[PDB]
Structure 1
Amino acid sequence: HKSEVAHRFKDLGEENFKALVLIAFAQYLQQCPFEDHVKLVNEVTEFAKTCVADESAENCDKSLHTLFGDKLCTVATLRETYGEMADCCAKQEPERNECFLQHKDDNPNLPRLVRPEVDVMCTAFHDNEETFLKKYLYEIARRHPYFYAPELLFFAKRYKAAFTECCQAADKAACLLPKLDELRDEGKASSAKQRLKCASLQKFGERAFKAWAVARLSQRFPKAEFAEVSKLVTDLTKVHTECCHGDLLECADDRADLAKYICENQDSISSKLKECCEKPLLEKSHCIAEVENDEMPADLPSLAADFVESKDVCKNYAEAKDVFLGMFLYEYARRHPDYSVVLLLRLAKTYETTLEKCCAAADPHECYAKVFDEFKPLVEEPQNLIKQNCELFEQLGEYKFQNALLVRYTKKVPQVSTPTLVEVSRNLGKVGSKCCKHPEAKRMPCAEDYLSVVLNQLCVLHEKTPVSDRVTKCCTESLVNRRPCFSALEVDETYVPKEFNAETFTFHADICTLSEKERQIKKQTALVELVKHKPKATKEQLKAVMDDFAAFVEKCCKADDKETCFAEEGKKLVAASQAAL
C-alpha cells in the first residue's frame, strides 16, 4: 500500500476513477467552471497512472487527503472566489482537510437545472456523449455537495442508460421523459433519506439509531443470530457516524470494510447475498444496503417464552437493559418483515415501559402478561390506515384520490401555503399508487419508506417558514411518533375563512392547452383555495361545486368561442357556488 492513489486506480478502474475525482472536486469547488475541473481530473489521472506504473514514483507515496488538498490549493482563483477556504491552505494536514470540510458549502446560489428539449439532449448525447454526461454530472455534483459520490455516480450510469435506449426510438420523449422523471424522484428521495439518516443520528443519539438498525438488520437477516446482528449494528453505527461527518475517503473505507466483512460471513448472515458480494468494490456497499430480505426459519417459537413466561426476566433485563431490549427487538423483527421499523420500535418501547414499571412491583410476572395485549392496538393502527386508504385509492383515481387528501389536509392545517398542500397531496397520492399495489405483507414497510421522506421534507419547509404549532410539534417529536402525530391532526376549528377573491377563481382559455399535469395542478390549486375560503363545506357540497366546475370546463373547451365562455359562464359558476356554500 505504498501508493494510495495507485491502489484506488486499480480497484475502481480509470473510468470510475475519473468520474469520482470529478465529483469530489465538483463538490468542493462548486463555483469553478467545468473546464477547470476537467483539467484537474486529467492532471490527477495522469499522475495516478504514473503511480500505477511505479509505486515508488516521486509523489506517489503521499496521502490521498494530502494530494487532494494540494490540488485544491493550486487553484489560482481560489482566494478570490472562495475567500476563507484559501486560508485552509496554511493549515497542515490533517488539520487542513478538516478545514476544507468546514468550508464546504451546502446548497449554494445556483439556478435550477432546466431539462432541455429531447431533440437537443439526444443530439448532444450523440455528438459528444462524454462531455455531455460529465457536464451534467458536474452540474448535479456542485449542487449536491454532501451527496455520497459513489451514489451520485450510481445515478449517472443510470442516466446514461436511459439516453442510450430512447435517443434512437421514434417517439423519444415518450420513452425518455418518464425515465428522467423516475430518476429525478429517486435521486431526491435518496438524497433526502441520507440527510435524514444522518440528522437522526445527531438529533436523537447513537442509542435510538442502534435500535432502528437492530430492527431492520434483523428483518433483512432473520437467519442471523443476535451476536452477529449486534456486531453489524455496532459497525453500522460507526459507519454512519463517520459518513455523516462528510469525509468521502474515510466514509468509503468504513463502508468497504463492512461490506468486506459481510461478504466473508455470508453463510452466517444471509443466503440472498451472493450476487451483491460478487459485484465490484464500488457497488458492494450499495448492493448490500438494499439487499432483499432473507426468508426466516420455519421453526420459530413465540417470544412469550423468553420475554413473558420465563423467570429471570427482570434479572436478565436489569443485567443489560439495552442488550435485552435489543434481543426482544431482534426476535420480534425477524418474525415480522411485514412491519414498519418504527412499528417494531413502538412495541420495543412499549415493552421497555412496562418492565420499568413492573420489575419495581412486588411480583413482576403479572404485569408482563399485560404487555403483549398492549401490542395489538399499536400494531393495527397503521394496518387499518393502509386498508382504508388503498381502498379509497382503488375506488377513486390517483387524481381523485389526491383531491380527497387535498380537502382533508387543507381542513386540518389551512394555514399552510397553497403550493405546499398541493405538492404533499400529489406526492401522498403517488405513494398510494406505488404501495397499494403491494400485498399487505409488504405494504407497511413500503409506506414507511416514502412517508418518511415526504414527512421530513414537509418538516424541513416548515422549519424555514413555520405556519402551525401542531405541525411543528409533529416535526420535532420522536421520529417514531412523527407519522402518528400527523395522523392525529383533526380539522382546525380555529381557522378563520380567508376573504373572497374573484381572481383566484377566475379561469381563462389557456388551461385548455395546458398539459395534463398542470391543468390538474391549477384545478387542485383552486380546490385548496376553495376549501380555504369556505372550510365548513360538506363533502356533498364540495362535490357539487367541483362537478359544476368540471362540466364548466368541458363546456368552454368545446365551444366555437372560448375566452368569452370562460368569462361569462365563469361568472355564472362563481355566483351559483358562492350561494350554495
Structure 2
Amino acid sequence: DTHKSEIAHRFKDLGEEHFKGLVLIAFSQYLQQCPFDEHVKLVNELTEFAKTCVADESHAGCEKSLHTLFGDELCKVASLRETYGDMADCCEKQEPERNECFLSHKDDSPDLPKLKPDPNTLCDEFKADEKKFWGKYLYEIARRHPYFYAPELLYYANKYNGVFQECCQAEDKGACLLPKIETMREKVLTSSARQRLRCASIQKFGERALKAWSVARLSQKFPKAEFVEVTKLVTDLTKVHKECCHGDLLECADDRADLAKYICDNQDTISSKLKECCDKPLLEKSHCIAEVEKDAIPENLPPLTADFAEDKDVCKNYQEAKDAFLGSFLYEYSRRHPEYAVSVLLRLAKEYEATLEECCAKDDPHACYSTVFDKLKHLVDEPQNLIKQNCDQFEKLGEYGFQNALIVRYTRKVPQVSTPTLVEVSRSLGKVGTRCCTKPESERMPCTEDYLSLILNRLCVLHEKTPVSEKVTKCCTESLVNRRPCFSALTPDETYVPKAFDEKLFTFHADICTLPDTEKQIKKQTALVELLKHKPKATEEQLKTVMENFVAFVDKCCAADDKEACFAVEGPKLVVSTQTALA
C-alpha cells in the first residue's frame, strides 16, 4: 500500500513553477542572510532531482523524506558556520532533530537593508526577465518574514508582476507604481503578522488553539454550514497551517489547493458567496475564499441557552468529548455573532470552559452553570471604554503624536524591553488609530481587538527570543486570548531602577536631517524611549516641554550654513535644560 516517492508526488501535483517557487521560499526562510544567486542554484539542483524521481521512482534517494533532502542540501553550504554560527552543528544531527534545529534559528528580526524601490531601474529589471524578477520578490519577502504563509506569497508575488505588467507601459511609471506597491506592501505585512500568530498558537499553546481559532473564523463566515461540515473544513485547515508553520511548504501548498477544491465543490452546503471565488485560477481562488464575505444567519435559530445552560445533560455531554462539545459551543456562538472579533469569541469559549470545569465539580452543577451567559454577556463590554479614550487621544494628536503617546505609555509599563522593540510595537500600535478609529462606532472595538493581537503577538515573539521583562513573559505565556487585557492592566512599577545616563543616546549629528522620513521619526522615537528608561517618572507637562524644545533644535540646526557646528553647540545646551527640567 506504498505510494513511494514524496518528492515525486509533490512535483506532479504542484507542477514545476510552483514547485520552484515554494522551494526558493523554503531556502529563503532557512537561510536569510544568503545571497539570491546561491538559492537559485540550490532550487535548480533539487528541481533536477525532482524530475529524475518523476522519471524513475526507484532511483536512489527518491524515497528519502522532503526534510532529509532539503536538509542534505543546507548542510553542503560552504558558508553555514562562518555565516550562521551554531546552526552548522545542526548538520551533526539525524532526522528529525536536524530539522527542528534549523527552524529554531529562523530570525524574526533579521537586520535587513530597507528596499528603497526606484521605478526606472525597477521597471528595467522586469522587462529584462519577468521570471527572475518574480523570484527576487519571493526571496526578499520570505527572508525578512521567515514564517510567511507560503501559498499566499506566490499569490502576492503574482499580484506584483501584475502591477508591472499594467504599469511599465504608462507614461509616468512612478505615478502608476508606488501607490499600488504601497497598498500592496501593507496587505503583505498584515498577512505575515497574521500567519506569525497562527504559528505562535500551535508552537506555544497547542494544535487545540489553532484548531479552535478556525472554528471561530469558519463558523462566522459560513454560519449555514452545519457542524460536521465545519468540523471537516477545520481538520483540513489546521493541517495546512501546522504544515506551513513547520516548513513543510510543499505539503502545505498542495493541501490548500485540495481544500480550495473541496470548498468550491461543496458550495451549496457551505455558503452562497463563493460562486465568484470558485472560478479563478488556483492562487486567486484560495485568496478569494480566505477574503470572502460572510453568509446570513439562518432565520429561526434556537436560542444559545438551549443546549448549553438548561440542558440537564451539559456536564455529561462535556465529559464524553470536551473538545467537541466546546468546538460545538464555539460553532454555535460564532455563527450568531459575526459582529464579534475572534479574539473575543475564543475568549468567550475559554471562559465557558472554565465554568464547566469548576461547576461540574460541585454537587448541583445546574445551579452553577445555568447562569453562565450573564457572566459571558458582561465579557463583551469590558473592552468598550478602552476604545473611546484611545480614539479621542488619537483624533486629538494624529498618528505620529499618538505613537509618541504610546511610546511613553508603554515604556513606563515595561521599561526592560529593548529599545528597538518598544519603538516598533508602539508605531504599529499607533497605526491601529488610523485602522480603526474612523470606522463606524459599533465596529471600532472588533477592529481594535483583532489587530492588537497581531501586534501584541509580535511583541511576545520579538521578546521571547531575548527574554528580559518578567511582565511581558507572564502576559505572553499565560494565555493566548487574554493578552490584550493583560497588557492593558499593566502599570508602571516602582520596582524598576532607572537607567544610568548615557551621553551617546542623546547626541545628534547632521545626518538626522538626511534620513528617509521613516528613519527620521525612528531616530527620534528611540531617543524618546531612552529618555523614559532614564527619567521614568517625568511628567506629561514636562515631556511636552522636551519634545517642543527638541523640535526647535532640529529645525534650528537643519537650517544653518554649518549644521555640524550647529549640533555641536546646541546639542549640549539641550541636554542641560532637559536634565534641569526633569531632574
TM-score, L = length of structure 2: 0.81
Name the CA shift for 1:401/1:304 in 2 (closer, same or farther; >3 Å): same
Name the CA shift for 1:68/1:572 in 2 (closer, same or farther; >3 Å): closer
149-158 or 510-519: which moved more? Answer: 510-519
User: Which residue number in structure 2 is paired with residue 231 of structure 1?
Assistant: 232
Residues 288-321 of structure 1 deviation map (CA, whole Å, 9 limit, x = unaligned): 3343322323444532333334544444444544
1:216 maps to amino acid: R
User: Which residue number in structure 1 is paired with residue 548 of structure 2?
Assistant: 547
User: Which residue number in structure 2 is paired with residue 257 of structure 1?
Assistant: 258
Determine the C-alpha separation between the residues in 2 that align with 1:507 and 1:422: 18
- 1:397 to partner: Cα distance: 0.8
Residues 405-444 of structure 1 deviation map (CA, whole Å, 9 limit, x = unaligned): 0110111112222222111111111222123233344444
Residue 341 (structure 1) aligned with residue 346 (structure 2): no
60-69 or 167-176: which moved more? Answer: 60-69
1:33 maps to amino acid: E
Q: Which has the higher contact order (CA 8 A, sep 6+)?
A: 2
106-115 or 353-362: which moved more? Answer: 106-115
Alpha carbons 2:150, 2:244 under 8 Å: kept: no
Name the CA shift for 1:573/1:156 in 2 (closer, same or farther; >3 Å): same
User: Which residue number in structure 2 is paired with residue 527 of structure 1?
Assistant: 528
Determine the C-alpha separation between the residues in 2 that align with 1:398 and 1:186: 19
Residues 507-566 of structure 1 deviation map (CA, whole Å, 9 limit, x = unaligned): 444433433323322222222222222221221222122223223433444556654554
Alpha carbons 2:26, 2:247 under 8 Å: kept: no
Alpha carbons 1:406, 1:421 under 8 Å: kept: yes
2:414 maps to amino acid: V
User: Which residue number in structure 2 is paired with residue 115 of structure 1?
Assistant: 115
Determine the C-alpha separation between the residues in 2 that align with 1:541 and 1:319: 61
Alpha carbons 2:10, 2:251 under 8 Å: kept: no
1:421 maps to amino acid: L
Q: Which one of the candidate residues 24, 33, 58 is aligned to 2:38? A: 33
2:384 maps to amino acid: Q
Name the CA shift for 1:365/1:521 in 2 (closer, same or farther; >3 Å): same
Determine the C-alpha separation between the residues in 2 that align with 1:287 and 1:333: 21
Determine the C-alpha separation between the residues in 2 that align with 1:244 and 1:262: 22
Alpha carbons 2:22, 2:250 under 8 Å: kept: no
Give 3-state SS (helix, strand or coil) of 1:274's partner: coil
User: Which residue number in structure 2 is paired with residue 385 of structure 1?
Assistant: 386
- 1:63 to partner: Cα distance: 11
Determine the C-alpha separation between the residues in 1 that align with 2:90 and 2:407: 46
Alpha carbons 1:499, 1:533 under 8 Å: kept: yes
User: Which residue number in structure 2 is paired with residue 125 of structure 1?
Assistant: 126
158-167 or 136-145: which moved more? Answer: 136-145
Matches within 5 A, 1:57-456: 78=76, 106-107=105-106, 112=112, 115=115, 118=118, 119-138=120-139, 147-167=148-168, 172=173, 176-177=177-178, 179-180=180-181, 183-184=184-185, 186-456=187-457
Alpha carbons 2:546, 2:578 under 8 Å: kept: yes
RMSD: 4.2
2:327 maps to amino acid: G
Count of aligned pairs: 567
Determine the C-alpha separation between the residues in 1 that align with 2:285 and 2:463: 37
Determine the C-alpha separation between the residues in 2 that align with 1:309 and 1:475: 36
Residues 159-181 of structure 1 deviation map (CA, whole Å, 9 limit, x = unaligned): 32343455455665565456545
Name the CA shift for 1:175/1:538 in 2 (closer, same or farther; >3 Å): farther
Name the CA shift for 1:492/1:75 in 2 (closer, same or farther; >3 Å): closer
Residue 466 (structure 1) aligned with residue 460 (structure 2): no
- 1:376 to partner: Cα distance: 3.5
Name the CA shift for 1:494/1:174 in 2 (closer, same or farther; >3 Å): farther
Alpha carbons 2:225, 2:269 under 8 Å: kept: yes
Matches within 5 A, 1:477-492: 477-492=478-493
Determine the C-alpha separation between the residues in 2 that align with 1:496 and 1:544: 24
Residues 495-514 of structure 1 deviation map (CA, whole Å, 9 limit, x = unaligned): 22333345433444443343
Name the CA shift for 1:143/1:571 in 2 (closer, same or farther; >3 Å): closer
121-130 or 415-424: which moved more? Answer: 121-130
Alpha carbons 2:112, 2:144 under 8 Å: kept: no
User: Which residue number in structure 2 is paired with residue 505 of structure 1?
Assistant: 506
Determine the C-alpha separation between the residues in 2 that align with 1:408 and 1:317: 43
Determine the C-alpha separation between the residues in 2 that align with 1:329 and 1:73: 40
Give 3-state SS (helix, strand or coil) of 2:115's partner: coil
Residues 170-212 of structure 1 deviation map (CA, whole Å, 9 limit, x = unaligned): 6655654565455555445434443432342243334333332
Determine the C-alpha separation between the residues in 2 that align with 1:300 and 1:72: 51
Determine the C-alpha separation between the residues in 1 that align with 2:66 and 2:233: 31
Determine the C-alpha separation between the residues in 1 that align with 2:74 and 2:445: 54
- 1:115 to partner: Cα distance: 2.3
1:355 maps to amino acid: L
18-27 or 362-371: which moved more? Answer: 18-27
User: Which residue number in structure 2 is paired with residue 54 of structure 1?
Assistant: none
Residues 345-389 of structure 1 deviation map (CA, whole Å, 9 limit, x = unaligned): 222232233334444545444433542222243211223222322
Determine the C-alpha separation between the residues in 1 that align with 2:7 and 2:481: 43
2:115 maps to amino acid: R
Alpha carbons 2:8, 2:50 under 8 Å: kept: no
1:538 maps to amino acid: T
Name the CA shift for 1:490/1:175 in 2 (closer, same or farther; >3 Å): farther
Where does structure 2 lack aligned partners over 5 or more consecutive residues? 81-87
Name the CA shift for 1:280/1:66 in 2 (closer, same or farther; >3 Å): farther
Determine the C-alpha separation between the residues in 1 that align with 2:65 and 2:534: 62
User: Which residue number in structure 2 is paired with residue 495 of structure 1?
Assistant: 496
Name the CA shift for 1:426/1:571 in 2 (closer, same or farther; >3 Å): same
Determine the C-alpha separation between the residues in 2 that align with 1:308 and 1:76: 56
511-520 or 211-220: which moved more? Answer: 511-520
Name the CA shift for 1:72/1:578 in 2 (closer, same or farther; >3 Å): closer
Name the CA shift for 1:103/1:326 in 2 (closer, same or farther; >3 Å): closer
2-11 or 207-216: which moved more? Answer: 2-11
- 1:333 to partner: Cα distance: 1.5
Alpha carbons 2:28, 2:143 under 8 Å: kept: yes
User: Which residue number in structure 1 is paired with residue 85 of structure 2?
Assistant: none
Determine the C-alpha separation between the residues in 1 that align with 2:77 and 2:121: 37
Alpha carbons 2:75, 2:91 under 8 Å: kept: no
Give 3-state SS (helix, strand or coil) of 2:427's partner: helix
Name the CA shift for 1:100/1:161 in 2 (closer, same or farther; >3 Å): farther
Name the CA shift for 1:410/1:268 in 2 (closer, same or farther; >3 Å): same
Give 3-state SS (helix, strand or coil) of 1:33's partner: helix
Give 3-state SS (helix, strand or coil) of 1:415's partner: coil
Name the CA shift for 1:62/1:173 in 2 (closer, same or farther; >3 Å): farther
- 1:245 to partner: Cα distance: 4.2
Alpha carbons 2:22, 2:249 under 8 Å: kept: no
- 1:45 to partner: Cα distance: 9.0
- 1:215 to partner: Cα distance: 1.7
Name the CA shift for 1:223/1:77 in 2 (closer, same or farther; >3 Å): closer
Determine the C-alpha separation between the residues in 2 that align with 1:342 and 1:351: 14
Where does structure 1 lack aligned partners over 5 or more consecutive residues? 52-56
Name the CA shift for 1:299/1:392 in 2 (closer, same or farther; >3 Å): farther
493-502 or 72-81: which moved more? Answer: 72-81
